Amino acid sequence: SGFRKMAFPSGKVEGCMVQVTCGTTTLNGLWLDDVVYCPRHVICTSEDMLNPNYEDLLIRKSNHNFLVQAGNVQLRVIGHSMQNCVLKLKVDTANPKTPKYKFVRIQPGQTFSVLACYNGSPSGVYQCAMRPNFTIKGSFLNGSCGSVGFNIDYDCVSFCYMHHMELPTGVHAGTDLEGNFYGPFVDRQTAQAAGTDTTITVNVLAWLYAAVINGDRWFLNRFTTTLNDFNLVAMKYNYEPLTQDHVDILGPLSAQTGIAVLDMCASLKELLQNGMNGRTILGSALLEDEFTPFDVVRQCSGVTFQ
Amino acid sequence: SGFRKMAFPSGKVEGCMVQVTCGTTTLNGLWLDDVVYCPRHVICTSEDMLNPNYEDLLIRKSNHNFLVQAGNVQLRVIGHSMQNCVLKLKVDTANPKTPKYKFVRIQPGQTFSVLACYNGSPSGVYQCAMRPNFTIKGSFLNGSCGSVGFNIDYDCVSFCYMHHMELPTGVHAGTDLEGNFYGPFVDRQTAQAAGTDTTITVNVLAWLYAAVINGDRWFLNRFTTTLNDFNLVAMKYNYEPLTQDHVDILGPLSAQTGIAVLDMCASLKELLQNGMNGRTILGSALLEDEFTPFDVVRQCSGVTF
Ligand SMILES: C[C@H](NC(=O)CN1Cc2ccc(Cl)cc2[C@H](C(=O)Nc2cncc3ccccc23)C1)c1ccc([N+](=O)[O-])cc1
Ligand SMILES: C[C@H](NC(=O)CN1Cc2ccc(Cl)cc2[C@H](C(=O)Nc2cncc3ccccc23)C1)c1ccc([N+](=O)[O-])cc1
Ligand SMILES: [Cl-]
């Protein structure tokens, strides 16, 4: 029993974190096999950030301008290239701690663990979600650039995020491991702002199914709804539209608890109208949206507490 | 910017987790040097759990009755002994991944990271606090016994908790690594219940400082209180008493934000009496009590391990 915001064990990623330095700038890199991946803005000064010409900045660098430190050992850079917004530094040593891995690009609503790092050293691990507006609500201080987001499946690490920047509202933006940004963001200090954020409806439904599995049913009602009427109400509370894909994805949780997806949608409509009236759901007074259907199935018991 | 419930990096502990099997029972063990530590109830059937005599159950076991698996390698048990509610299995191989460590017993209100494990394989890491009633609000399924809690100080892992059981309300109970329970619990299938819990006042104040540091000030007010008047109000809401030690501990956060501890107490008093009025603090509609003053300073300063 219980339900916590749980991260994957970070050990497999901790053995890949290194420090990358270019001139006065120091940030984190991810060392996998003989390549170190890091944000390309490591080659910029603060002045370069308004309108950096990364190609022009990079051509002026040699391999020996990049200092890569793995623990207390200096790695030798033998090649460099830029791919989108990521710099790939070929090094003369393959990481002996390289786990079984993959690079995956995720969609909004997906969750992942973040290993916050500073100077190539891990400080903490936390769980978060790719918001519908393509930002993440992280906890990142200066020096955290290059920290990565990941999921683990059977000893295989799927890297999905690399941290690049903090936006004016305090939220965070980054790229996949091929250097493509999530969202309409760019690695320059120009006027950029996150779009209006919304609640991840399919995740709130998954978390209501988690509450039922753990024994709580107070929020259920005798009603059902059509998918269209649910969306018309949900959109008024700044909730993302619920698609037939989301309904299909909730199928297993619906079968385990005996509560139809549209019947759980009716419960959500009522919670949005009434609030919680002093009650909590899984120890929260707000509707939680950073647990996916897959996270709920992974964490919860396969036996509902009837 | 940002403020998350953050756990310590778990790598140093992951390299210590093993699977321990005795008959039909499988649970997790912690392998440090040449000893594997695990709950002593691994030697109980289920009928034995009703009224176990652990010495009588243990004397009937040989070293070969304990199957210890580290990854895909079987470890050889060469000795066994019991210390309080923990079984210590001496093995023929020292763990090459043994980190610098200590066994420490924590006090209620202190936080730690839990590495949830099943079959000697880590599944997740989360942060929690030892409640004033000595339980932890964990997330554990069958097979999680032997999972451990820890903190990291510089390069040293301080192990503080080993999971033993789930209570009827869904909360959890366990021991320190010397096998002493936190709370009035016993490792037996008998009627046991968590006592009435209280809120950790010093931690709520620390989290209010974290909110101020991160730009939320709506709850600040022009008022102050005495420590005595604050405690009279706090006891009325099932909050733990605030001591001069707690006030001293919050000193640095008070100096950084310019909000005296008793000034923050006046803000907390008004929140208890009036609620949040539709507002949130750090994305929460409840007053969070599972961040200590040190956790707040650490997260707001970027300490690494
Ligand atoms: C908007 C402003 N950015 C800058 O002053 C300098 N940054 C420009 C910039 C542009 C583009 C790209 Cl790709 C990277 C970067 C760098 C950046 O965002 N780095 C960081 C990343 N993550 C977390 C940070 C936390 C504190 C400081 C830097 C962080 C550097 C700012 C204002 C206030 C705060 N705050 O935490 O209160 C953070 C940031
Ligand atoms: C109370 C009841 N316990 C038992 O059925 C058998 N347990 C007796 C027992 C006694 C004493 C000691 Cl020291 C240990 C133990 C074992 C135990 O508590 N193990 C566990 C530990 N943590 C988390 C568990 C989660 C599900 C099942 C076991 C867990 C075994 C129970 C009923 C339902 C649930 N549930 O969440 O659905 C949890 C627990
Ligand atoms: Cl995805």
CSV table of C-alpha atoms in Angstrom, one decimal, chain A residues 1-12 14 115-119 121-129 136-141 155 166 170-172 280 283-286 288 290 298-301 305, chain B residues 1-12 14 115-116 121-129 136-141 166 168-172 280 283-286 290 298-305:
chain,number,residue,atom,x,y,z
A,1,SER,CA,0.0,0.0,0.0
A,2,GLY,CA,0.9,3.7,-0.3
A,3,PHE,CA,1.5,5.9,-3.3
A,4,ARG,CA,4.5,8.1,-3.7
A,5,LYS,CA,6.1,10.2,-6.5
A,6,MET,CA,8.8,7.7,-7.2
A,7,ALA,CA,11.9,8.1,-9.3
A,8,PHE,CA,14.0,5.3,-11.0
A,9,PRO,CA,17.1,4.3,-9.1
A,10,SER,CA,19.8,6.7,-10.4
A,11,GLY,CA,23.0,4.5,-10.2
A,12,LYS,CA,23.1,3.7,-13.9
A,14,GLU,CA,25.4,8.6,-12.0
A,115,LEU,CA,19.3,13.4,-11.8
A,116,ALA,CA,20.2,17.0,-10.9
A,117,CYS,CA,24.0,17.5,-11.2
A,118,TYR,CA,26.6,20.2,-10.6
A,119,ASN,CA,30.2,20.1,-11.7
A,121,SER,CA,28.5,15.4,-9.5
A,122,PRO,CA,25.0,14.2,-8.8
A,123,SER,CA,23.1,16.1,-6.1
A,124,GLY,CA,19.6,14.6,-6.1
A,125,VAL,CA,16.9,12.7,-8.0
A,126,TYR,CA,13.3,13.6,-8.6
A,127,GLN,CA,10.4,12.7,-10.8
A,128,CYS,CA,8.7,15.1,-13.2
A,129,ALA,CA,6.5,15.2,-16.3
A,136,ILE,CA,9.2,20.9,-17.1
A,137,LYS,CA,8.7,22.1,-13.5
A,138,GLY,CA,12.2,21.2,-12.3
A,139,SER,CA,14.5,22.2,-9.4
A,140,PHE,CA,17.6,23.5,-11.1
A,141,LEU,CA,20.2,26.0,-10.0
A,155,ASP,CA,18.3,-2.5,-16.8
A,166,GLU,CA,15.4,28.3,-17.1
A,170,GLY,CA,10.9,29.6,-13.2
A,171,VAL,CA,10.1,26.6,-15.5
A,172,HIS,CA,12.6,24.7,-17.5
A,280,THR,CA,-7.7,14.3,0.3
A,283,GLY,CA,-2.5,12.4,0.6
A,284,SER,CA,-3.1,15.3,-1.7
A,285,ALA,CA,-5.6,18.2,-1.6
A,286,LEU,CA,-5.1,18.9,-5.4
A,288,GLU,CA,-2.2,15.2,-9.3
A,290,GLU,CA,2.4,13.8,-12.9
A,298,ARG,CA,4.1,-0.2,-12.2
A,299,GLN,CA,3.7,1.2,-8.6
A,300,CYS,CA,0.2,-0.1,-7.5
A,301,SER,CA,-0.7,-3.6,-6.5
A,305,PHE,CA,-8.4,-3.1,-2.1
B,1,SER,CA,14.5,27.9,-9.3
B,2,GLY,CA,12.0,25.1,-8.5
B,3,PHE,CA,11.4,23.0,-5.4
B,4,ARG,CA,10.9,19.2,-5.6
B,5,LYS,CA,10.7,16.4,-3.1
B,6,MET,CA,14.2,15.1,-3.9
B,7,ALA,CA,15.9,11.9,-2.9
B,8,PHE,CA,19.7,11.4,-2.6
B,9,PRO,CA,21.3,9.7,-5.6
B,10,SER,CA,20.8,5.9,-4.9
B,11,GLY,CA,23.8,4.4,-6.8
B,12,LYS,CA,26.0,3.7,-3.7
B,14,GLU,CA,22.0,-0.1,-5.4
B,115,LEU,CA,15.4,2.6,-2.2
B,116,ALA,CA,12.3,0.3,-2.8
B,121,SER,CA,16.6,-5.6,-7.6
B,122,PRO,CA,16.0,-1.8,-6.9
B,123,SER,CA,12.7,-0.5,-8.4
B,124,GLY,CA,12.4,3.1,-7.3
B,125,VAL,CA,13.7,5.8,-5.0
B,126,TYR,CA,11.6,8.2,-2.9
B,127,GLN,CA,12.0,10.7,-0.1
B,128,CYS,CA,10.1,10.4,3.2
B,129,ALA,CA,10.1,11.4,6.9
B,136,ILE,CA,6.7,6.1,7.5
B,137,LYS,CA,4.2,6.8,4.8
B,138,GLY,CA,6.0,4.6,2.2
B,139,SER,CA,5.0,2.9,-1.0
B,140,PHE,CA,5.7,-0.8,-0.6
B,141,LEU,CA,4.3,-4.0,-2.0
B,166,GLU,CA,2.9,-2.7,6.7
B,168,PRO,CA,-3.5,-1.9,8.8
B,169,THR,CA,-3.8,1.8,7.8
B,170,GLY,CA,-1.3,1.3,4.9
B,171,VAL,CA,1.6,3.0,6.7
B,172,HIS,CA,5.0,1.3,7.3
B,280,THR,CA,-1.3,27.2,-3.1
B,283,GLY,CA,2.2,23.9,-5.9
B,284,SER,CA,0.5,22.4,-2.8
B,285,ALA,CA,-2.9,23.1,-1.1
B,286,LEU,CA,-1.6,21.4,2.2
B,290,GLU,CA,8.5,16.3,4.9
B,298,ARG,CA,20.8,21.8,0.6
B,299,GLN,CA,18.3,22.0,-2.3
B,300,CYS,CA,18.6,25.8,-2.5
B,301,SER,CA,22.5,25.5,-2.6
B,302,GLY,CA,23.3,22.5,-4.9
B,303,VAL,CA,25.3,20.2,-2.6
B,304,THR,CA,26.7,17.2,-4.6
B,305,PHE,CA,27.8,13.6,-3.7
